[model samples]
Target: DEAWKQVEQLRREATQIAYRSDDWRDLKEAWKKGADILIVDATDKDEAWKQVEQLRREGATQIAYRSDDWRDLKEAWKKGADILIVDATDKDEAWKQVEQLRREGATQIAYRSDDWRDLKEAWKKGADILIVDATDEAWKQVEQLRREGATQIAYRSDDWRDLKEAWKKGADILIVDA
Candidate 1:
C-alpha cells in the first residue's frame, strides 16, 4: 500500500467539491475549469486504469488509486498514474515498491501514515507527501512537520477546529475524508 503510505501534499488556492449522484456533473464542471482532482475508488486494476486514462484524456494531471494488493498498484501506475496510496500498515513493503516504481519512472508518491513517528520516518525515507488523520497524535506530527520546514501540509477533515489550527499553523493544503 505504498500509495496511501506517505501523505497528501500540493496546495490549491481553492477547491469546489460537490456530490451529485446523477453522474458527477459537478466533477465534470470542475474539470472543465481545469481542476485536477485526486479520486479514490476500490475496483479491479483494469477498471481503475480505464477510468484514469479517460480522466487523463480530459486533462487531469494527477490521479491516485489505493488498494491492499500490489498488482492493483502496478496496474494503476502502468496506466500513467501520478500518485498511488501506500498505507502505514504496509510501510516496509510499500517503500520497497516505491523504490521500484521510482526506478520504473514514477517521480511522485503519496504516503498516508497515522503514527507521527512513522510519518516522520516515511518522510525521511523519501516519500514526497504525507497524509495524516485528524487525531491529536497526528495533529502533533503535522505541527512537527511544519516546524521542520514542510511548507505544505494536508489535514484530512472538515472539522473547523483542526482546519483553524492547521491554518494557524500555516498549512498549505486541506484534505478531507471522502
Candidate 2:
C-alpha cells in the first residue's frame, strides 16, 4: 500500500539518501520518502554491520560503508555492504579484503587516492571504484586514468556540480565529497 506511494514519489524526483545520524523512525520516513540508497558511517565494526543489517531488513538494495579501518572492510562484507573503501596506504590489506570478499560473494570494491601516485597504485590494484577529493590535480589524474580504462571515479570539490558535469564526460562513477 505505502510502498506504491513511495515508488510514485521517487518516480517524480531524483534519488535521495541519508546518513546514520538519522533516527530509525526518521530513517523509515526517508525510506518512504524514496531514498535510493542510505549511506551510513559506522562508529565501529559492530555498529556498522548492525546498521547494514537494519538496511537489509528495510529492503534497501544498496548501502555503502566507509571507514579507515581494514577490519571494517571485513565486517562490511559480512554485512553485505555494496561498496567498501580502502585508503592509499592500506591498498595491500584492502586488496586482500577484496579478494576475500569475492570468495565470499562480493562483486565490487572501492578505493581512494589522495595523489597521482596513490591513483596509479590504486589503478594497479584494480579497485572497482576510485575516489578523488577536491583538487585540480585529482581531476587531471582522473581523466588520464580513465583514458587508461580506470573507470568508477568519485570526487569532491567546492565547485562539485560543475566539476561533476565536466567529469561525467570521462568518469563512470559518482562524484561526491563523502
Candidate 3:
C-alpha cells in the first residue's frame, strides 16, 4: 500500500518504467538504468518471499512478483508485495476479479498479455498497470490506453528496432530482459 502511494506520487510527475529480468545482475543494472519498478520471476516459493524483502533493500524502488495464481497473489500481498501481476489471457471475466481486488484495498493491479481487444476493458475496470507485447496493433491499443490516462508498459522481447518503436509509440514503461 505504501508502495502504491509512492507510485502515485511518482506517476504524477513522470512516466514510470518497470523492467523484468530473471537475472539478479540485470535487475541491478535496470535499477541503475532508471527503472522505477522491477518485476522479477521468483521460482523458489520460500526464497521468493525471502527475496522480496532483500530485493527492496537492494535499491528496487518498487517490486512485484510475476505470478497469477490467487494463492500466490494473496501470499505475496501478505508478505508485503506492493504490486501483483496476473495474466488476463482467456479470462473474459478478469475485470470482475480486478475490481474486487481493488475493493479489498489491494494497492496495485497489473494485467499482462497482448489481448488488445481487452485493453480498454482492463483500463476501464481499474487495471493500474498493463504489460503488453510489442506489436503494431498493441501500440495502437497502448495509445488508446495512454489517452485514457492508463499506464501502458511494453513488454519487449525483441530487437532494438522494435524496442525503439515501443518507446516512440508512448509506452509509459518498458519491460525488457536485456
For 1-178, candidate 2 gives per-residue lDDT tens digits of 1223323322332222222232334444555655544555647666667877887787776666766565676677577667776654565665565455555554566666656456656556545766665445456766766676765665544453434543554654433222
TM-score leader: 3
> TM-score of predicted model 2?
0.66
- Candidate 3 or 2, higher lDDT: 3
lDDT of each: 0.54, 0.55, 0.62
Q: Which wins on TM-score, candidate 2 or candidate 3?
A: 3
lDDT of 3 by residue, 1-96 (tens): 122333223333345656665655566666776767777666676777666666666756677776656466657667656777766656665665
RMSD of each: 6.6, 6.7, 7.1
Residue runs of model 3 more than 4 Å from their true location after superposition: 1-15, 23-25, 135-137, 148-153
Candidate with top lDDT is 3
What's the true lDDT of residue 125 in model 1? 60
Q: How good is model 1 by TM-score?
A: 0.70
User: Comparing candidate 1 with candidate 3, which one achieves the higher lDDT?
Assistant: 3
> By lDDT, highest first, what's the ranking?
3, 2, 1
